[PDB]
Structure 1
Amino acid sequence: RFLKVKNWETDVVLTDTLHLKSTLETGCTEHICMGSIMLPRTKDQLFPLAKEFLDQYYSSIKRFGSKAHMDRLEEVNKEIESTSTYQLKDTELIYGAKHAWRNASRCVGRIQWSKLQVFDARDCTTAHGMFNYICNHVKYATNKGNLRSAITIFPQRTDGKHDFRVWNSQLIRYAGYKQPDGSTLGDPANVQFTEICIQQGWKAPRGRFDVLPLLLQANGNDPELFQIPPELVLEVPIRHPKFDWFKDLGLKWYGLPAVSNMLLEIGGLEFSACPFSGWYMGTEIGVRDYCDNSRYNILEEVAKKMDLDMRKTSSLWKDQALVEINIAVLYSFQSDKVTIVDHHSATESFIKHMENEYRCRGGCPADWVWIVPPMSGSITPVFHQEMLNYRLTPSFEYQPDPWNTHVWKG
């Protein structure tokens, strides 16, 4: 089967065949679309998953059907039979992590997918060991502001009772503190996690931008607290190129976006701790982190200081302040030589990437709802681009927050 997608700005039509390789389900049916819903192993099932992956790996290196390919299938089959699991070769792990990124339909940054530094941490055994690996990742990826994409991969799941987990949602994130008066100091997104850290013994500074400690679980054991060395945490004070009062808002953000709570699936194996990092698209900070009502919520204060007419929404004071904040974020990162991409550049690159994938790969699964930036949607080319969303493996998946599932040793 062939499915076509059209771009309504350019009339370019693309043809998707890659969707034929999807196995996992979307949530939709012929009767309902769940496109805007945020969240819609015995040996038995494992060998087919391993075989499908190894077939893809061997095809990619142009060795499909070779003796090396056949011997590797045989080796994995026997390993599964006798140990109930198997270990990936370093080459397969690298290929697999790159492809999980390539396959991430919610990621606008995938033009970069083949440039990913993979740190193999499968020899790690303790939370202190994880801490060391994570510091090294942060220092490597940060590279004094010249950000480099990277992923660190801790040991895979065995019986599900010995999981490695980073309890942080991102490696670098700001604390949030609910006050007795119902207001929040710092990042309201992180209140629950901040409370857990405090309970575990963290001495909270109780400021507006306190970098959270790492809370690290090795081998199914109770998690342990570590402070990332402050000298490894690059931050950017936010100022505006024209508005000199902007700096006195006291805003800053960190340079390194590093997701630490997803699960990486390769060949049926599950890597429950696989922190990965890239660089920011400006709107992530300037639109969502700063301007969501449920986050730092700065629109009002910004608009006030700009002296916009705030008595009617139709003055578009919110839209005006939003643009100025996003200018400030890009200006500040660029002035400090910390890698960042604006939403125009990022989406234009994504379209070129998507066209290339259709041509070379037969498709590019993409989730329009997430790919379109949260401001200025239709002045970016992705708004006008039809997309097809489906699930390919290797993949990054959500997993339940570990405080909800962890069995405490005490």
Structure 2
Amino acid sequence: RFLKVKNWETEVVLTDTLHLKSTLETGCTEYICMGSIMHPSATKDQLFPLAKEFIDQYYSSIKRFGSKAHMERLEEVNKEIDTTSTYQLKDTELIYGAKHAWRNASRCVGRIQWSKLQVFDARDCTTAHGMFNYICNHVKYATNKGNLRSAITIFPQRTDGKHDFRVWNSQLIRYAGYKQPDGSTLGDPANVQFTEICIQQGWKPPRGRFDVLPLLLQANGNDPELFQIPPELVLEVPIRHPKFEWFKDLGLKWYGLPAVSNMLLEIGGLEFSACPFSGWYMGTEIGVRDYCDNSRYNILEEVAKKMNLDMRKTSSLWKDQALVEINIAVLYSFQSDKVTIVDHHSATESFIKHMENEYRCRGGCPADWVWIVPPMSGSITPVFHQEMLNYRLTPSFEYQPDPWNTHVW
């Protein structure tokens, strides 16, 4: 059936037809909704229909469905799955597939940009040194001296599952975290385990509060190897406040490049287990989650001190006041340093515009309200009031197991 989504602020109703194209499960049933669950629950035989479906939609998008090129491609893929139990994507198909995995990513508020994605083909890579080279070039290109550019680098697909390419870092650029003798934690507490895996592999930690982790790279199922990203490639921003001159003395910094490296890109039944991709930050990612999550850098109490706020009762909203100032600082700092960043008002506004675009030209836009609504000031952004439908379209970005749980050394 045709499903309707309403905006309760504008009373705009949109009609979703696109959902009729899904086949992958959401996790929900008619009786139980798993909308807030973060991670809900090949062979030649399985591979061809998937390949067939992807090839069909590719030639549908370039308006040549049933064409000779289309027919020959379908035949081509058949013989190759037949004789090798896999197949290789054409360049045009790789690029199409990567852009549409982004386009279909229901948890991403940045998708108005989806067709502007620089795709780096790294499928000829064979070694960790090779991966390091490709990743360094990605970082340099994407960073672009502050004028950030969306990019994805795609390493060889899975074959037998014993020769996977993996970036072991969850993101390309992150700060180390150290368990202190006295029980506390220096740096990013979320990364303590990974940091210690790096130390155990020979990494000499500076034991500072913002130490860029090394890359840990696995090529063709081999033991991973360590590499330091050259520092001039790692763009960082000191955080200061436009009114509070004491804010710089907190000693805060962050990296300019958000780059997810632990996901799996699926295209036409092929699995790309190493596909680091990057964009630019929304301010709240740093200001709210990275800095103020209790399990992260956790700086609210400190900032509240310097603001001289009364912190005895929660109903003074002292946390809320500190939160807003921290996020003002982050936006101000990046902007002052000419580093691309978007505030959550601008981003969610762009997303509503994007949704409208997709409903008109595509018949829908899969979207995960739980992830799209920002972690602060939710209802004064327009996505809070926007009904969204969530469903799974392929090509897609999927989660995969942590490498350190499925790798025989």
When the two structures are superposed, what TM-score results if normalisation uses the length of structure 1? Answer: 0.99
Task: Choose 179-188 or 88-97, whichever is displaced more.
Answer: 179-188
Residue 379 of structure 1 deviates from its aligned partner by: 0.1
What do the CA deviations read for 1:351-408 (whole angstroms, capped 9, x no partner)? 0000110110011000000000000000000000000001000000010100000111
Give me the whole-angstrom Cα distance separating, in 2, the residues matched to 1:180 and 1:69: 63
Residue 180 of structure 1 deviates from its aligned partner by: 2.2
What do the CA deviations read for 1:186-233 (whole angstroms, capped 9, x no partner)? 001111100100011000011000000000000000000000000100
Residue 76 of structure 1 deviates from its aligned partner by: 0.2
Give me the whole-angstrom Cα distance separating, in 2, the residues matched to 1:338 and 1:278: 12
Match runs of 1:32-51 below 5 Å: 32-40=32-40, 42-51=43-52
Match runs of 1:52-63 below 5 Å: 52-63=53-64
Give me the whole-angstrom Cα distance separating, in 1, the residues matched to 2:203 and 2:58: 44
Residue 182 of structure 1 deviates from its aligned partner by: 1.7
What do the CA deviations read for 1:29-75 (whole angstroms, capped 9, x no partner)? 111110001111x1000000000000110000011100000000000
What do the CA deviations read for 1:70-120 (whole angstroms, capped 9, x no partner)? 000000011000000000000000000000000000000000000000000
Task: Choose 65-74 or 179-188, whichever is displaced more.
Answer: 179-188
Give me the whole-angstrom Cα distance separating, in 1, the residues matched to 2:19 and 2:407: 36
Residue 179 of structure 1 deviates from its aligned partner by: 1.2
Match runs of 1:337-352 below 5 Å: 337-352=338-353
Residue 299 of structure 1 deviates from its aligned partner by: 0.2
Residue 164 of structure 1 deviates from its aligned partner by: 0.2
Three-state SS of the structure 1 residue aligned to 2:302 is helix
Three-state SS of the structure 2 residue aligned to 1:200 is coil
What do the CA deviations read for 1:154-177 (whole angstroms, capped 9, x no partner)? 000000000000000000000001
Give me the whole-angstrom Cα distance separating, in 2, the residues matched to 1:301 and 1:179: 19
Give me the whole-angstrom Cα distance separating, in 2, the residues matched to 1:37 and 1:68: 42
Three-state SS of the structure 1 residue aligned to 2:217 is strand
Look up the match of 1:83: 84
Three-state SS of the structure 2 residue aligned to 1:325 is helix
Residue 273 of structure 1 deviates from its aligned partner by: 0.2
Look up the match of 1:95: 96
What do the CA deviations read for 1:308-365 (whole angstroms, capped 9, x no partner)? 1111111110000000000000000000000000000000000000011011001100
What do the CA deviations read for 1:247-298 (whole angstroms, capped 9, x no partner)? 0000000000000000000000000000000000000000000000000000
Look up the match of 2:247: 246
Three-state SS of the structure 1 residue aligned to 2:246 is helix
Give me the whole-angstrom Cα distance separating, in 2, the residues matched to 1:181 and 1:13: 57
Identity of matched residues, %: 98
Task: Choose 75-84 or 173-182, whichever is displaced more.
Answer: 173-182
Three-state SS of the structure 2 residue aligned to 1:244 is coil
Give me the whole-angstrom Cα distance separating, in 2, the residues matched to 1:242 and 1:187: 27
Runs (4+) of structure 1 exceeding 4 A deviation are: none
Give me the whole-angstrom Cα distance separating, in 2, the residues matched to 1:270 and 1:370: 25
Give me the whole-angstrom Cα distance separating, in 2, the residues matched to 1:239 and 1:327: 9
Task: Choose 179-188 or 385-394, whichever is displaced more.
Answer: 179-188
Give me the whole-angstrom Cα distance separating, in 2, the residues matched to 1:197 and 1:177: 11
Runs of 5+ in structure 1 lacking a partner?
none
Give me the whole-angstrom Cα distance separating, in 2, the residues matched to 1:90 and 1:184: 46
Three-state SS of the structure 1 residue aligned to 2:350 is helix
Residue 178 of structure 1 deviates from its aligned partner by: 1.0
When the two structures are superposed, what TM-score results if normalisation uses the length of structure 2? Answer: 0.99
Give me the whole-angstrom Cα distance separating, in 1, the residues matched to 2:135 and 2:371: 28
Across the two proteins, how many residue pairs are aligned to each other?
407
Give me the whole-angstrom Cα distance separating, in 2, the residues matched to 1:369 and 1:267: 28
Give me the whole-angstrom Cα distance separating, in 1, the residues matched to 2:2 and 2:86: 36
Give me the whole-angstrom Cα distance separating, in 2, the residues matched to 1:73 and 1:206: 55
Give me the whole-angstrom Cα distance separating, in 1, the residues matched to 2:181 and 2:155: 39
Residue 181 of structure 1 deviates from its aligned partner by: 1.9
Give me the whole-angstrom Cα distance separating, in 1, the residues matched to 2:201 and 2:55: 42
Give me the whole-angstrom Cα distance separating, in 2, the residues matched to 1:54 and 1:407: 35
Give me the whole-angstrom Cα distance separating, in 2, the residues matched to 1:250 and 1:361: 47
Give me the whole-angstrom Cα distance separating, in 2, the residues matched to 1:33 and 1:19: 17
Give me the whole-angstrom Cα distance separating, in 2, the residues matched to 1:23 and 1:201: 45
Residue 26 of structure 1 deviates from its aligned partner by: 0.7
Give me the whole-angstrom Cα distance separating, in 1, the residues matched to 2:57 and 2:237: 42
Three-state SS of the structure 2 residue aligned to 1:270 is strand
Give me the whole-angstrom Cα distance separating, in 1, the residues matched to 2:179 and 2:71: 58
Look up the match of 1:161: 162
